[PDB]
């Protein structure tokens, strides 16, 4: 179940940044194999230049590009334990998703600092602060706490009470709450839709990496 949610969310997140460099991906299991768009992604989210890409089609060219990306990531303190260029160049689905996660964590989440609390725990504390006035919300994690969509709706309402009538909402229609939050954030906050409501609500514990990714966009949009 987790691969499907991460593929949707991680692909949308990458595309929210790649659009700023004039390109998009479609199929995350194949569209980073040559390293070219992976290098582009890292340039957009960091503001730093990487070495010139190699546009040759043979394998050793792809290895060279992917290493530029992985070595850059490692220069930023990310310990790459189990990911190497070979896996990424070969289209390994698990490792590709794992690599995009460490990028999301390093560049979207790591530097979030809130009341002396950083990264995942800092983002959670931020969510807890912003949803405090809503008694029908209890953020205690990045999975089951978000299943009914009220959390997302409350984050929006807390910053932009003019965009959503929060008082109307309740737990009975969790599909609709998620879709409402996502449509509003897309149309008004420049945050693309990154979750599938149906995947989320009908999984006992939805994928926390996907949820963190999407929630981190709200953090940055409101900062």
Verbal overview:
This protein is mainly α and 223 residues long. It folds into two domains: 112 residues, Calponin-like domain (Actin-binding Protein, T-fimbrin, domain 1); 111 residues, Calponin-like domain (Actin-binding Protein, T-fimbrin, domain 1, Orthogonal Bundle). 56% of the residues lie in helices and 2% in strands. β1 and β2 form a beta hairpin. α6 crosses α10. The PDB classes it as actin-binding protein. Keywords: actin-binding protein, human alpha-actinin-2, calponin homology domains. The assembly is monomeric. The entry is titled "Mutations in the Calponin homology domain of Alpha-Actinin-2 affect Actin binding and incorporation in muscle".
Major beta-sheet overview? 2 strands, antiparallel
The CATH C-level class name of the largest domain: Mainly Alpha
What is the N-to-C succession of helices and strands? HHHHHEEHHHHH
* CATH superfamily descriptor of the largest domain: Calponin-like domain
Shape: elongated
CATH architecture descriptor name of the largest domain? Orthogonal Bundle
| Total number of distinct structural domains | 2
PDB class: actin-binding protein
Keywords: actin-binding protein, human alpha-actinin-2, calponin homology domains
Assembly: monomeric
Entry title: Mutations in the Calponin homology domain of Alpha-Actinin-2 affect Actin binding and incorporation in muscle.
Task: Outline the secondary-structure elements.
Elements: H1 2-18, H2 36-46, H3 59-75, H4 85-89, H5 93-109, E1 113-114, E2 117-118, H6 119-130, H7 150-159, H8 174-189, H9 197-201, H10 208-222
Antiparallel strand pairs: 1-2
Helix pairs in contact: 1-5, 1-10, 2-3, 5-10, 6-10, 7-8
């Amino acid at each position: 179940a987790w691969e499907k949610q991460q593929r949707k969310t991680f692909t949308a997140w990458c595309n929210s940044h790649l659009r700023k460099a004039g390109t998009q991906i479609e199929n995350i299991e194949e569209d980073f194999r040559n390293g070219l768009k992976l290098m582009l992604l890292l340039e957009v989210i960091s503001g730093e230049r990487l070495p010139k890409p190699d546009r040759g089609k043979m394998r050793f060219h792809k290895i060279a590009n992917v290493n530029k990306a992985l070595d850059y990531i490692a220069s930023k303190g990310v310990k790459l334990v189990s990911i190497g260029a070979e896996e990424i160049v070969d289209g390994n689905v698990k490792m590709t998703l794992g690599m995009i996660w460490t990028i999301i964590l390093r560049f979207a989440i790591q530097d979030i600092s809130v009341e002396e609390t950083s990264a995942k725990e800092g983002l959670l504390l931020w969510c807890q602060r912003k949803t405090a006035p809503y008694r029908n919300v209890n953020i205690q994690n990045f999975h089951t706490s978000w299943k009914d969509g009220l959390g997302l709706c409350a984050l929006i309402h807390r910053h932009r009470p003019d965009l959503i009538d929060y008082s109307k909402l309740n737990k009975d229609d969790p599909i609709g709450n998620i879709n409402l939050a996502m449509e509003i954030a897309e149309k008004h906050l420049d945050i693309p839709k990154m979750l599938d409501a149906e995947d989320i609500v009908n999984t006992p514990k939805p994928d926390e990496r996907a949820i963190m990714t999407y929630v981190s966009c709200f953090y940055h949009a409101f900062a």
